[PDB]
Amino acid sequence: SVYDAAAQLTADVKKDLRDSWKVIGSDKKGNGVALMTTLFADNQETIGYFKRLGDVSQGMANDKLRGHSITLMYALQNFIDQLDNPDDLVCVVEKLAVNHITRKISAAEFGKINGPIKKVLASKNFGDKYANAWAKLVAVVQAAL
Amino acid sequence: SVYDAAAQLTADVKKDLRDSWKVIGSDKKGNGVALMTTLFADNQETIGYFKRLGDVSQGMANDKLRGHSITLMYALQNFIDQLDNPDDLVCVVEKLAVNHITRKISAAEFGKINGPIKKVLASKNFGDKYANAWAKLVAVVQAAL
Numbered sequence: 391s392v393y394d395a396a397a398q399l400t401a402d403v404k405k406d407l408r409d410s411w412k413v414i415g416s417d418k419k420g421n422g423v424a425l426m427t428t429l430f431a432d433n434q435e436t437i438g439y440f441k442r443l444g445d446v447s448q449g450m451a452n453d454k455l456r457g458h459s460i461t462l463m464y465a466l467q468n469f470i471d472q473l474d475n476p477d478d479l480v481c482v483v484e485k486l487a488v489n490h491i492t493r494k495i496s497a498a499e500f501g502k503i504n505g506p507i508k509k510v511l512a513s514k515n516f517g518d519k520y521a522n523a524w525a526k527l528v529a530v531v532q533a534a535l
Numbered sequence: 536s537v538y539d540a541a542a543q544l545t546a547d548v549k550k551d552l553r554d555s556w557k558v559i560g561s562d563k564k565g566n567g568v569a570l571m572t573t574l575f576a577d578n579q580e581t582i583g584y585f586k587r588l589g590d591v592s593q594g595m596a597n598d599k600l601r602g603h604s605i606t607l608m609y610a611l612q613n614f615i616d617q618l619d620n621p622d623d624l625v626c627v628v629e630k631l632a633v634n635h636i637t638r639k640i641s642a643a644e645f646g647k648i649n650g651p652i653k654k655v656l657a658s659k660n661f662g663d664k665y666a667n668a669w670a671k672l673v674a675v676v677q678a679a680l
């Protein structure tokens with residue numbers, strides 16, 4: 391029910407996503423890496439999916455981790471840019487879901503990214519209001535998994 | 536090697552990439568789909584790799600094709616944004632190469648995107664000078680396959 395989940399992205403939710411992304415997306419390498427290292431720190435078990443990245447404890451210094459982290463932020467950039475057209479938002483979200491389904495990543499597992507997002511947002515002084523908005527965007531992806 | 540190929544992106548090459556992307560990257564959906572449809576038209580042999588997308592001739596109306604096309608443009612956006620730092624450019628290029636290697640896409644196969652890029656650029660009054668600059672960026676990826 392991707393379209394149904396997209397319906398939860400109301401005018402106010404879209405506004406908070408764009409306002410917070412204006413800051414978070416301004417440093418894709420820095421915030422992308424912070425997002426990943428926080429995920430690994432708070433949910434060590436997720437590291438099992440990233441054996442290809444090697445020594446993730448290296449953080450920013452790990453070229454593969456950095457490459458993945460920056461690339462992840464462009465997926466979010468893609469989503470933010472499509473917010474005003476649900477037909478396009480839905481097709482790019484389903485595109486993203488394809489490889490995650492193949493990796494056998496469930497909606498519950500994918501949702502573990504909510505904690506890291508909440509923390510990265512707070513480090514930039516974006517409170518619960520914004521974290522909730524982001525959880526709603528993540529929920530659109532969860533609906534496709 | 537990808538490191539030697541990245542070093543081929545000289546000052547003027549980087550500038551021409553930015554100037555042309557300024558225009559082509561303004562309409563990621565339209566130019567992204569144009570890019571893909573041109574690939575399938577001039578190189579029908581490549582269609583086999585995109586079985587999941589379905590009836591590719593539907594163009595913009597094919598949701599999966601549209602989703603793929605928009606997403607492809609954000610990878611180019613990624614590359615353009617990393618031109619300032621060779622180390623970052625290389626790590627995002629190698630990241631992109633991973634799934635293409637898995638699909639057994641060779642450097643020669645990947646290089647078939649040069650024709651479509653040249654044609655999309657030309658439609659926007661960007662000549663050979665620009666097509667050649669983009670061929671050099673594509674060569675960085677080819678070096679990682």
Ligand code: HEM
Pocket residue numbers: 436439440442443458461462465466486489490493495499500501502503630633634
């Ligand atoms: C905001 C959430 C997320 C976004 C936007 C996102 C985005 C992406 C993108 C764009 C890629 C590269 C293209 C691809 O191979 O599909 C990727 C790869 C991947 N993602 Fe996700 N992802 C997210 C969360 C997660 C989570 C929570 C997990 C697992 C617990 C996960 C596991 C993976 C894995 C294993 C890869 C491959 C990494 C590699 O070997 O390079 N992703 N993701």
Ligand code: HEM
Pocket residue numbers: 488489581584585587588603606607610611634635638640644645646647648
């Ligand atoms: C400028 C050149 C290109 C760029 C930037 C690019 C980018 C991408 C991106 C971002 C994805 C989605 C993430 C992933 O699954 O890895 C993708 C998927 C894919 N690419 Fe590439 N690509 C390019 C050229 C090509 C070429 C020339 C071929 C084959 C002849 C190819 C075949 C594929 C296939 C089959 C998929 C999966 C499609 C699907 O099932 O949704 N790509 N590419």
